[PDB]
Design a protein around this nucleic acid. Sequence first.
RNA 1: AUCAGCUUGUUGGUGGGGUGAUGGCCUACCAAGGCGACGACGGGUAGCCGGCCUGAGAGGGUGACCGGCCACACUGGGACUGAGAUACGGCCCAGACUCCUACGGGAGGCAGCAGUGGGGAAUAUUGCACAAUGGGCGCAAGCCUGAUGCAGCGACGCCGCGUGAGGGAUGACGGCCUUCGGGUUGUAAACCUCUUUCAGCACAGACGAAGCGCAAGUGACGGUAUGUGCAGAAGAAGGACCGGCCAACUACGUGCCAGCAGCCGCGGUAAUACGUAGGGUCCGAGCGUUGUCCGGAAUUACUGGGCGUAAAGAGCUCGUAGGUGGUUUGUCGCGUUGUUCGUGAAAACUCACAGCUUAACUGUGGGCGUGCGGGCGAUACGGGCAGACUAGAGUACUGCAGGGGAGACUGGAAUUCCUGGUGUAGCGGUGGAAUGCGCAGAUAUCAGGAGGAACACCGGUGGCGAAGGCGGGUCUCUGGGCAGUAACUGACGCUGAGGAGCGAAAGCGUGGGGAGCGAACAGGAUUAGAUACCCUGGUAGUCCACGCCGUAAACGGUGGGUACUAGGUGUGGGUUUCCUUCCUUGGGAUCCGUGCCGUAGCUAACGCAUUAAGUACCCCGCCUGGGGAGUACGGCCGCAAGG
RNA 2: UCGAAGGUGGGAUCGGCGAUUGGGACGAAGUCGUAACAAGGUAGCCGUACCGGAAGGUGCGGCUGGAUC
RNA 3: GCAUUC
Lengths: 48, 122, 32, 131
Amino acid sequence: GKIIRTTKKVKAHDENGEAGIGDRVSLMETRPLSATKRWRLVEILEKA
Amino acid sequence: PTIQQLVRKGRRDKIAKVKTAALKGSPQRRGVCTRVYTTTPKKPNSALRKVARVKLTSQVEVTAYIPGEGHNLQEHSMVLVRGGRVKDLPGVRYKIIRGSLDTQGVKNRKQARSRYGAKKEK
Amino acid sequence: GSVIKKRRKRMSKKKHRKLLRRTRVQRRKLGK
Amino acid sequence: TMTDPIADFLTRLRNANSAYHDEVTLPHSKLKANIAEILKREGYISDYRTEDARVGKSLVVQLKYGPSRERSIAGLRRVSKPGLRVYAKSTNLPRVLGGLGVAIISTSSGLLTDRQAARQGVGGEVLAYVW
RNA sequence: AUCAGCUUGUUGGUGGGGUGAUGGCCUACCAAGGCGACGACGGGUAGCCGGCCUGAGAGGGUGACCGGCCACACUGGGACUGAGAUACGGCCCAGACUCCUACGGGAGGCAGCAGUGGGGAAUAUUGCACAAUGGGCGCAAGCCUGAUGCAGCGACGCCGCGUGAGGGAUGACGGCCUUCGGGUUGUAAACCUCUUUCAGCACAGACGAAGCGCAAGUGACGGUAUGUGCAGAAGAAGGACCGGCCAACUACGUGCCAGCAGCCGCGGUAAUACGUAGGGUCCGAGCGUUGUCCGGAAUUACUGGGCGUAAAGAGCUCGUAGGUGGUUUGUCGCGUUGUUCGUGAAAACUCACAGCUUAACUGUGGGCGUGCGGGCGAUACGGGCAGACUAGAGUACUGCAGGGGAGACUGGAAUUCCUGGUGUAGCGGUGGAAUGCGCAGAUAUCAGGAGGAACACCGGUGGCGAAGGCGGGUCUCUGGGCAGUAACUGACGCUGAGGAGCGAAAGCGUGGGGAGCGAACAGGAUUAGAUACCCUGGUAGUCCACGCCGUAAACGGUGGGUACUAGGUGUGGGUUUCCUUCCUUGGGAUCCGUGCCGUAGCUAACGCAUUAAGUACCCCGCCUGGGGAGUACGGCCGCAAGG
RNA sequence: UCGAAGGUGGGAUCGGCGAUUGGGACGAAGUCGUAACAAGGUAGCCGUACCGGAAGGUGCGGCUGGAUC
RNA sequence: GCAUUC
Ligand SMILES: [Mg+2]
Ligand SMILES: [Mg+2]
Ligand SMILES: [Mg+2]
Ligand SMILES: [Mg+2]
Ligand SMILES: [Mg+2]
Ligand SMILES: [Mg+2]
Ligand SMILES: [Mg+2]
Ligand SMILES: [Mg+2]
Ligand SMILES: [Mg+2]
Ligand SMILES: [Mg+2]
Ligand SMILES: [Mg+2]
Ligand SMILES: [Mg+2]
Ligand SMILES: [Mg+2]
Ligand SMILES: [Mg+2]
Ligand SMILES: [Mg+2]
Ligand SMILES: [Mg+2]
Ligand SMILES: [Mg+2]
Ligand SMILES: [Mg+2]
Ligand SMILES: [Mg+2]
Ligand SMILES: [Mg+2]
Ligand SMILES: [Mg+2]
Ligand SMILES: [Mg+2]
Ligand SMILES: [Mg+2]
Ligand SMILES: [Mg+2]
Ligand SMILES: [Mg+2]
Ligand SMILES: [Mg+2]
Ligand SMILES: [Mg+2]
Ligand SMILES: [Mg+2]
Ligand SMILES: [Mg+2]
Ligand SMILES: [Mg+2]
Ligand SMILES: [Mg+2]
Ligand SMILES: [Mg+2]
Ligand SMILES: [Mg+2]
Ligand SMILES: [Mg+2]
Ligand SMILES: [Mg+2]
Ligand SMILES: [Mg+2]
Ligand SMILES: [Mg+2]
Ligand SMILES: [Mg+2]
Ligand SMILES: [Mg+2]
Ligand SMILES: [Mg+2]
Ligand SMILES: [Mg+2]
Ligand SMILES: [Mg+2]
Ligand SMILES: [Mg+2]
Ligand SMILES: [Mg+2]
Ligand SMILES: [Mg+2]
Ligand SMILES: [Mg+2]
Ligand SMILES: [Mg+2]
Ligand SMILES: [Mg+2]
Ligand SMILES: [Mg+2]
Ligand SMILES: [Mg+2]
Ligand SMILES: [Mg+2]
């Protein structure tokens, strides 16, 4: 019954490279764009 | 232990030692007996205990007790072996069924007959 | 607790060390 | 360090109740204040007040002992605790001493007792049992 | 993890190819990525589920039938046809096996139904129908259907019913006990009447078909089920158990034998436990035994356990991931909570109701389906986000105690040796002796010299250090702690899987040193022996330099942090108020150590008890009957010992 | 081009047997001592080292889970 | 001082 925190890596498509390492971003599911990739970058929400 | 420890490792149940392994999960196993011989019980008890060395269809050699007061068995006899621990004997885990295959039911039985393979008298 | 418990372990350990003494050279030659 | 102020509050209460102390002083918190309010309304304590200390407010809880020095609190148990937090649906609300005690349930409607929560049909976090 | 790294079409991009469709699916080039202690890559095992069994529940075990998915069709590979292909009764190739041959070459595939051999403790008929329901083709009549509906066989399971009912005596015979009175079997039996359920022998005889064909015939089961007559208690009871658990006791027969047994345990010429008999008990067309799973087992403990001495706190720290988080304002609505909608197939389960003569069984309608997804509501609590605060934590400043550590130099007592006096014949050693040292000048005594190691008194159940540990003096370098003041920062905290560091003594490597002590090793003594204890000697070692090793009853046999819960009394280090001499162990208060004694509470007891083993919260380590065994194997570390 | 089966090669890994050899458990009334439990007749035990038919002895450091005073 | 065993 303890609340357990778990982390999942995801591969997302962004055309322009607008989100760098360490930034906080929003994603949406999409069709398969390649093996693995099933997410697209919607908006880079808070850069750091 | 703390909940975190339980979440990390968990509880591990005691592993169950598989009993009566030579039956291979069967209720009984057929076997051919190599030797018939009497054996001494453990120190407080004293008797001559009738025992057979049985090669099972499971391809395991086993010692089996012969229940009843009198037996017909000798080398190459075909017997049916069931589970059964005889406390007195050190290594004996299986008993031979009386009344099955080559083993005759014990003579002059009148009570507990079904456990000794004797027909009802007419 | 009783020293009996320690004495049981003592014996087993001592016999093992003595076994290791007697087989030392054998273990080297057979481990090569 | 200090890790559960509410458990500390309950144990200060429990230990003073065992020692037959008339008063208990605590570091004030708004959550402790609301719990003390519930204990007053349910009759387990006599009164409480908020005083000032050097650096913050202090909660003073006055314990209730009947004639022939008989404790009004029979037991006090911290139920939800850091990490292992306990939540109850309105239909699964816990009963304390078959209903003769009180469970303190934190709800979006505020702190309530199992009785109130069940009437209002709300669930929440089960903070403590009192009996 | 006794499986720590794996991956190069592999991870991503662009241009082509390919497909019904997206996509390294394929391909060429370009970038160097991707997955892993939230166990990658390996190894072992296994079809999954609705459900089933067990269980108070949580959980545990399991996946037979029935129902849904998946996978395969002698073994391996491949495609073709088609709306659709693991193509079981298709095709092509290769292999194994069986068969035919004219020797050139051919032909097979029951994990469909039935059946055979084989393996095994063990699992059925080489039935009858397409009448009903579902399916294929046909406009349709119809044809096909080992799907299916039924029948056969096996107490294999569940449920129902029968094997008789009423009466019948101071209570027969016979059996078995006995206090020789009798007592049990036992109302039992015999006998006297009463009803024929189920079986038996006759005579009627279906529903399943608002079907099908509309040509008018058509039910496999089946002359079955079920009704109505006839005869007569007539044909129909067994199995286990009876020492305690656990319901039910006596006699005889063998006497530690023959045997019994789930456990404890019963048999040694008087057994309620062995065997038989009488009696009894529990179940009944079944009763027992073996195997298997759950329960009892709170005995892996989430519900629901522990670690001073019973099994269990890492030798001690530091710290990585992780877990956890003081007070307060606003906000999000992720966790949590309310509500509504969708879904959670049927069966099963459960409540109700109905149908089979009842039941099992079957059907209908609710619930169940704990879940998940969408919309909308709440914001106490957890969390995210943006702030504030000083009580936790850390810093600064002023004082203070200390064998805390490291380096260098240095002091005296004593032992030993050496040199030289004086001086002799003993010394030395033990429970008592002897080896031994002397008489070649010992021991003893005096003076001088050398050299090594340990630091008497101070010195304590006292101080310091994380633990191991630390005591002659001085100097140099250096770590920690405590109090006072709140000057400063503003939760920066706690713990810590792995990991790293420190870690008594012994031991190991190289180079020094070696007075005393002293494993091994010699003698002497003791003794039955004496590989010992005692004596005389004595080598490694003990010491230093620099490494290694990584164990101890490394102990408080008690992990770390924090808060709270009667007191009394010692002692170590600070602060302060009063009494005043201002004598000061005068006394109080307060903070931080270290002891003893004692409440409450806890504990199996012993005991612990504000320095908890009490009342609670956070994190780690560890336990799960005794032996085998902290052993083997594998691996890592080490020069070795070994850890 | 890809490609089943087949061939060759050097390794992985899981087992079976093996002259000989190590310890472990159990067994009746065998042999040798007497190490531990009382101060067990030298207090016992822990780590380590060397030694001895065997238990075990001794050194160094540690513990009380040690009697008497 | 010495004193093994059942
Ligand atoms: Mg393309
Ligand atoms: Mg399989
Ligand atoms: Mg249970
Ligand atoms: Mg096609
Ligand atoms: Mg076929
Ligand atoms: Mg076909
Ligand atoms: Mg078949
Ligand atoms: Mg067979
Ligand atoms: Mg049809
Ligand atoms: Mg028609
Ligand atoms: Mg046909
Ligand atoms: Mg009884
Ligand atoms: Mg359980
Ligand atoms: Mg069991
Ligand atoms: Mg326990
Ligand atoms: Mg503890
Ligand atoms: Mg212990
Ligand atoms: Mg410790
Ligand atoms: Mg951290
Ligand atoms: Mg908080
Ligand atoms: Mg956090
Ligand atoms: Mg359903
Ligand atoms: Mg030095
Ligand atoms: Mg001289
Ligand atoms: Mg002299
Ligand atoms: Mg740490
Ligand atoms: Mg660790
Ligand atoms: Mg040393
Ligand atoms: Mg050496
Ligand atoms: Mg050395
Ligand atoms: Mg040297
Ligand atoms: Mg000596
Ligand atoms: Mg080191
Ligand atoms: Mg250790
Ligand atoms: Mg120590
Ligand atoms: Mg320890
Ligand atoms: Mg603690
Ligand atoms: Mg104190
Ligand atoms: Mg006390
Ligand atoms: Mg305890
Ligand atoms: Mg062991
Ligand atoms: Mg080892
Ligand atoms: Mg090894
Ligand atoms: Mg061999
Ligand atoms: Mg002795
Ligand atoms: Mg002794
Ligand atoms: Mg002696
Ligand atoms: Mg002793
Ligand atoms: Mg010696
Ligand atoms: Mg010593
Ligand atoms: Mg003897």
